[PDB]
RNA sequence: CCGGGGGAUCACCACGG
RNA sequence: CCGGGGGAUCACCACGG
RNA sequence: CGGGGGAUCACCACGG
């Protein structure tokens, strides 16, 4: 098949859903963007490299924009008031089997499950305590 | 409310679940670990700081053990061959409201939802194609 | 046990209460922040140190914001029109027992009790007369 | 009308109350002192000034003594074994209305309310934890 | 839960018991002190660090004071005639499981059990022979 | 009386107890070890000296083997991965009476009593939180 | 290339290795 | 950072790596 | 360490 497909980044229950689609693979960096002007789009990038002799490194990036309409020179333009940036690096040893890797994915999913500590703190503009 | 509580990191459907619990709070850095030797434990740390004048920044770290052919409670060397490391840094502009932050969390959840490109690639020991 | 938890900074009956929650505790400085936009949040910090041979010194800071919306270029952001800054330093000799400290706290509470000179002047943009 | 009057600094039920009375108001600095030996008295001072173009600044000071008798050469005098010194500075922009100031006072009162982190730590010779 | 709780350091059978409580966690050093003036208090501190790549180090400190009342400048002050200092470092490899660690705790407890060699010598102001 | 006798280091309720016995007295340093190869033994050494004019100092050392997955009588390398080291230094001012010293011992016993913070943390492969 | 609860305007930058 | 049956007024100091 | 020294508030300059 091919895993370079579009997926929904922000699930808002069928309405207001932010879906992101493949837009580039130049230089080994897979890119996805929302159906917007490049200045207001959601961006997701991913890449893998054999960082060392004995392990691989996945580098993922996500950009969440705060869309706005700005007036520059008396003209209105679609812009982003600001952006939130997520940068993550995952280092996996070459000795990890597929089951070993599913474990990693499940842990990451559990980490952000609704109601858990971390996602709770982030959504409330607070720390852990 | 007080979010520093134990939670399920790896959900294996009730049986075989991996729970992670509070183990340290030195220097504001919250830590959680599973019931294992520190060399084979699942570790999670989180912390927030004001990186700059306009940004707040969360640093989240997760360590996952290689389980295939593992010897529980044994000395496994080299350490690098038996562990995966996840480094996450989330930058959020100071103008983000709680709602904005909820959306950011949703985006993170969507990025790793089962069946999506990234988690599928990682779990299959592969890249994008 | 822990006193690094959330508390009510401004008691407005039981609804419009301003609550402040732990956010960061790095380098011996505990920091509390109210929810939502960090740009419009109340901030409280506290620290203790041995200022000298016989003295222990507390440094407390509080920031009260004037919530407002800033529109520029048609782009509006949540900001603080201005902030009120309170900085206080309390020195207590190492000979002070717990009873001595309870008294010091009572004095601070009395100084600001409703109806007394100091709080009355501040609440009215006035000085002493 | 006058707010330069005596008030209760330490409320000990209704008997061992520490009352502080006007003593001097020279050079824009109001001073209150408790009765009896000046050497063992509680002291409170307050002043306001225009720290800058947009800011008005309050400077408040409080001294809590540790009453004791000093014998030297067979001659005993009433003195203060030591003193606890509180110095606070409050800055309020000239745009603050009376309501804004009432709020600032509420915040100060809340910060020191019985049971909250700060007063609890001080009353126990402790810091934050 | 939280293990940062108060505990009794010196058990004297319900009467004359020296109990110690949490008082600080600044800079990752957990501190406990007895309910005394800071100049006469019992002190207990603890901290963990990943000393090397393959092991952790616990650093514990205990201070036992000999309380006295000293007359400085004709005034009486609560002081400590002298202090006994206990400094201990415990290095545990990361490969140690929880059971491996309970073993360490039991050994330390056995080492100081009433009647055993070491505690006997210490309490008699003598060496081993 | 002559305290250099064997004793129970690890009390496992009669069955599975670890006894440690006198094995060396070279240079005034008393040593005790369990019945194992020196690479897997429980070791205890103790010594007293006058560190300075006003202080006497006890140096106590304890070595505990990692037991999980251990191979009795086998060659286990690296040595650092299979052993925990405890270093204790107790400083007692020359004015301490036998009674004073008994209290010091009690404090040490209390610090490590079952259920208290420190032993609980160590046994759970964790820190304070 | 590796490191940091280093920074960013975010596939970039500085520092230390 | 590591070491000492190095020292302390005890989260510090000196020395050797 | 000082100031009824200032701030955009754990920063800044002047004083020892």
From Swiss-Prot, chains A, B, C, D, E, F:
InterPro entries: Levivir_coat, Phage_RNA-type_capsid
GO cellular component: T=3 icosahedral viral capsid
Gene Ontology molecular function: any one: structural molecule activity
UniProt-annotated location(s): Virion
Keyword line: Capsid protein, RNA-binding, T=3 icosahedral capsid protein, Translation regulation, Virion
Its biological purpose: Capsid protein self-assembles to form an icosahedral capsid with a T=3 symmetry, about 26 nm in diameter, and consisting of 89 capsid proteins dimers (178 capsid proteins). Involved in viral genome encapsidation through the interaction between a capsid protein dimer and the multiple packaging signals present in the RNA genome. The capsid also contains 1 copy of the A2 maturation protein.
Effect of residue 78 to A: No effect on the organization of the T=3 capsid, but with a loss of thermal stability. Complete loss of infectivity
Lineage: Viruses, Riboviria, Orthornavirae, Lenarviricota, Leviviricetes
Name of the featured protein: Capsid protein
Effect ascribed to mutating residue 76 to A: No effect on the organization of the T=3 capsid, but with a loss of thermal stability. No effect on infectivity
Species whose genome carries this gene: Escherichia phage MS2 (Bacteriophage MS2)
Subunit description: Homodimer. The capsid proteins form dimers that assemble by group of 5. Twelve such pentamers are linked together with free dimers. The homodimers binds to the viral RNA via an operator hairpin, but also to many other RNA sequences in the viral genome; this interaction probably shifts the virus from the replicative to the assembly phase and ensures specific encapsidation of the viral genome.
Family membership: Belongs to the Leviviricetes capsid protein family.
Pfam families: Levi_coat
Keyword check for RNA-binding: yes
Primary site of residence: virion
Region (Viral RNA-binding): 31-104
């Amino acid at each position: 098949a091919s895993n370079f497909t579009q997926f929904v980044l922000v699930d808002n229950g069928g309405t207001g859903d932010v879906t992101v689609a493949p837009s580039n693979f130049a230089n080994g960096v897979a890119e996805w963007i929302s159906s917007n002007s490049r200045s207001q789009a959601y961006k997701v990038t991913c890449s893998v490299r054999q960082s060392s002799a004995q392990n691989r490194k996945y580098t993922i990036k996500v950009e969440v924009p705060k869309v706005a309409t700005q007036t520059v020179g008396g003209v209105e333009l679609p812009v982003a008031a600001w952006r939130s940036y997520l940068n993550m690096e995952l280092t996996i040893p070459i000795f990890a089997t597929n089951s070993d890797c599913e474990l990693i994915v499940k842990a990451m999913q559990g980490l952000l499950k609704d109601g858990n500590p971390i996602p709770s703190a982030i959504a409330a503009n607070s720390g852990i305590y």
